[PDB]
Symmetry: C6
Subunit: 90 residues, 6 copies
């Protein structure tokens, strides 16, 4: 199933992105990843058109957070199931 | 229920924010998150108007801490319960 | 067996690299390593010519990720089995 | 009970602060927190006037450490007990 | 027994150093240490002249890795056994 | 008992400091602490005059490590036993 992710610098902005993503389309929040250097990603799963709508809303909400910084965003439509048991996206 | 969060650079300032937030309104401190790079967030839950009063007081106290730096602050009024079992806000 | 790895700055770009690598050749994703400072590597195993095709595709996909940054890439054709029980490449 | 904390950049300077704090007043060292980026805090508890005397001595000792850097210092006199079970200050 | 170590910035370059070290002399890879800030070290043990040959080959291979950076290298010929149970070199 | 500590930037240089300290006086290596940002400390215990001799030798050896950087050094002669059960110096 399709995967969407928004990476911010800072925790409060990632939470806003995570809230705005789930409220914007039929997606479920499945993942929260921390890789250091203040870089934090939230991950959603769903239909690709729904994930597109969630990520769109997630980005513009996280941008408006006080001291919020979006670092990177990305969507994959049909990720290989090999990723699912190696990377924390589910 | 509503969520409020203040992210500082440095530990002592996050503790002051956490103390000033709980003392400023009917909220309960539920979370302390560390994402690296000296970035640390404390999280409170309560009624949105109470969370607004706590966050307001939390910010101006943390700012007055010696070597204190507030990085980002944010309030969500009715976060989706999907966040609660993925992100450490409860 | 041959090992290929792509290191990015940021999580979403590493996931794209990991997806693009597995979809580009007969390789299996075996590893995801985090060393701090936003530096994250995904690792694939397979035949050397297949790993070359995967890494090639992995790099140009990760480069096109919004806010994606490839830091370092490398392929070893017949790594010593001593590495396999010390480093997380399998 | 009152809480005092000194955050340094570097480990040896935090240990000197921790030693100088306990030797300067009736306080007990209860906490050592690491938040990344070389930022490290030691925490003492006691009477507020005692904590003031400890923190005063802690700061000027840590400053004289070779390559020592104090980042932030702070004292709370009667922190809310809500903090005690969320933050590592006891 | 003698210890050799190469520290790189980045994971793929440390793996190349680790592979090139074991393939260059009678040494065994025993250690992989992560200290943050992208700084990563691989450690080999063996005869000092063998460790010298491995480290020599490890360095020039890691240097040729795409985006590879060697930060620090060092050899000790007869380290004290006190180190062995405190530091992860065995 | 007296405590001595040398903090370096990088792992190989901390190991050299740890080896040079134990070989320079009647001290025992007891601790290895990692606080992020490449900052790493080794800690020795012993008589204060012995710790002085070890730290002296530890510093000039770590300085001569290829890419070695000493960040901070410090000695306490009679640290309070309160530190021993809060900080990893024993």
């Amino acid at each position: 199933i399709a995967v969407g992710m928004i990476e911010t610098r800072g925790f409060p902005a990632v939470v806003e992105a995570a809230d705005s993503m789930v409220k914007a389309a039929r997606v479920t929040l499945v993942g929260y990843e921390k890789i250091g250097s203040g870089r934090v990603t939230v991950i959603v799963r769903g239909d690709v058109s729904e994930v597109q709508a969630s990520v769109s809303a997630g980005i513009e909400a996280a941008n408006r957070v006080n001291g919020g910084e979006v670092l990177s965003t990305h969507i994959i439509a049909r990720p290989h199931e090999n990723l699912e048991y190696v990377l924390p996206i589910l």
